[PDB]
Amino acid sequence: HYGITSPISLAAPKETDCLLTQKLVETLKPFGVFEEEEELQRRILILGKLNNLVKEWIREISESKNLPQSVIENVGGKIFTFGSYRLGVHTKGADIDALCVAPRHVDRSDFFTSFYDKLKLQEEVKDLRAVEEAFVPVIKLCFDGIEIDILFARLALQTIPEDLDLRDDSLLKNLDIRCIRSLNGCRVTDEILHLVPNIDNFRLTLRAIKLWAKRHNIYSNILGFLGGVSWAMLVARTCQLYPNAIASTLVHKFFLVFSKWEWPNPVLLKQPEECNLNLPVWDPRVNPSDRYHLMPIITPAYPQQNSTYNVSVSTRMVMVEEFKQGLAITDEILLSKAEWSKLFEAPNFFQKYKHYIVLLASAPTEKQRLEWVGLVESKIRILVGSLEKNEFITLAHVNPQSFPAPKENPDKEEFRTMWVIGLVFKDLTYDIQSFTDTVYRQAINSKMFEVDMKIAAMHVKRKQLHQLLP
Ligand SMILES: Nc1ncnc2c1ncn2[C@@H]1O[C@H](COP(=O)(O)OP(=O)(O)OP(=O)(O)O)C[C@H]1O
Numbered sequence: 001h002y003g004i005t006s007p008i009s010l011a012a013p014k015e016t017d018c019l020l021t022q023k024l025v026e027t028l029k030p031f032g033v034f035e036e037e038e039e040l041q042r043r044i045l046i047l048g049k050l051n052n053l054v055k056e057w058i059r060e061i062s063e064s065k066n067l068p069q070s071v072i073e074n075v076g077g078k079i080f081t082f083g084s085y086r087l088g089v090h091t092k093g094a095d096i097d098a099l100c101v102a103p104r105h106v107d108r109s110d111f112f113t114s115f116y117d118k119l120k121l122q123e124e125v126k127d128l129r130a131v132e133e134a135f136v137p138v139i140k141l142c143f144d145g146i147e148i149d150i151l152f153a154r155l156a157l158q159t160i161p162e163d164l165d166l167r168d169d170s171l172l173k174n175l176d177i178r179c180i181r182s183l184n185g186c187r188v189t190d191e192i193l194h195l196v197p198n199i200d201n202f203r204l205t206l207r208a209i210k211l212w213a214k215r216h217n218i219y220s221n222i223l224g225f226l227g228g229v230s231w232a233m234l235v236a237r238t239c240q241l242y243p244n245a246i247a248s249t250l251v252h253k254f255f256l257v258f259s260k261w262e263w264p265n266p267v268l269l270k271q272p273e274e275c276n277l278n279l280p281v282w283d284p285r286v287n288p289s290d291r292y293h294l295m296p297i298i299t300p301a302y303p304q305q306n307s308t309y310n311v312s313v314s315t316r317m318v319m320v321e322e323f324k325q326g327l328a329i330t331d332e333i334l335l336s337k338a339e340w341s342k343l344f345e346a347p348n349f350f351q352k353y354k355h356y357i358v359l360l361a362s363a364p365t366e367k368q369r370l371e372w373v374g375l376v377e378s379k380i381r382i383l384v385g386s387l388e389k390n391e392f393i394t395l396a397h398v399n400p401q402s403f404p405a406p407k408e409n410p411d412k413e414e415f416r417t418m419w420v421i422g423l424v425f426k427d428l429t430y431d432i433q434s435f436t437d438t439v440y441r442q443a444i445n446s447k448m449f450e451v452d453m454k455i456a457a458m459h460v461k462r463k464q465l466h467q468l469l470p
């Protein structure tokens, strides 16, 4: 079997489950979780073009280096997709994450020079932008309407074989960290796909779980909840425990298993192996720092990492309760006492808590609003953190989805966004003011602050939350 433990059950579905699974599929369609076939075809064609461009570019580099016409004919090179698109659960509007793999004689500087310029002159390319200095260097672009994220890695091979498998740990041998980092995404996705007993059953279940998570305000890695990869690993673990089950049963078991999971026990998809390389590896036995993590979900490819180290007491507590409510609803569905539509109902967040904090961010232009909001979102856990230190707080629940905030100046156009944070109690002006000052200070010291960029927060009872949003 798959996984580090024996499965819970090997039982196959009954015709009863088959019909329940078909109903799940019908309930999901209206939400747009299934991309249209025509769009899927368009994306396939886009990838074919990119792949040929990569091959063409590498051939040119090979020739310009007077390499023997011997190698030139077989240097190869290709694009490897990873992430949501590769797992097949991407939704309308999602980008395509791809890794350009080239032989050793192709340098990173070439990727950002000759390849970049090749893309620049393609008719289908718009908004071409390079981010060479990021943790993971990338070239971003809009290709025929589809957003593409392209990473780069030059392997210690003279030629790139078509059957090259990136899961081989030896490939990381003494490579620059930028290359190692650029390879992790493809390796994690490929590992996941080879760690579940049935890919189709796994896929449908994940589509369901991701929609459920978003609809229940717990979808966001940045804010301390779970991101796409983390949800995929939890679904994968569930699949390993019920190898012959189909989607309707797997969705139900997903809530059974995780609502009862004993955190901080880690979620592992396979047994980790020890590798000589000196890369960061999550392991509480040898790293005391990892012992503090509250809800560990470990990536399966070396070097393994905790995909959810941002989880705090508040977010974990919120998600545990959501898993329990999810289980209850699926129990009803299995008894035909409720429809799948009830599981995807997005409760009114603006009513589940007695107290809230409203966070406002604004800028002089729409362009600056976008940049500002990104910066502020990355700091919100600082406020949550300080709130958890407050003797009167049980938890703070940040609704990951922000939205346009009401007007303030009726005479001029405004570019303002807002977040709503739910609170649970066992004066918050000092903690809020302290967080406000910190955001301004860090932004300014980072050279990422523009005049007139504002941020303000207020505490308000549920009843008065009414008079502060459309
Ligand atoms: N531009 C990027 N730079 C670095 N890592 C990336 C980038 N895009 C994706 N990844 C990595 O791949 C993981 C899986 O990607 P995926 O979940 O498909 O992207 P996503 O960010 O959810 O989608 P969107 O970018 O919103 O369309 C998430 C992250 O660890």
Ligand SMILES: [Mn+2]
Pocket (backbone or CB within 6 Å): 083, 084, 085, 094, 095, 096, 097
């Ligand atoms: Mn993506």
Ligand SMILES: [Mn+2]
Pocket (backbone or CB within 6 Å): 095, 096, 097, 149
């Ligand atoms: Mn991306």
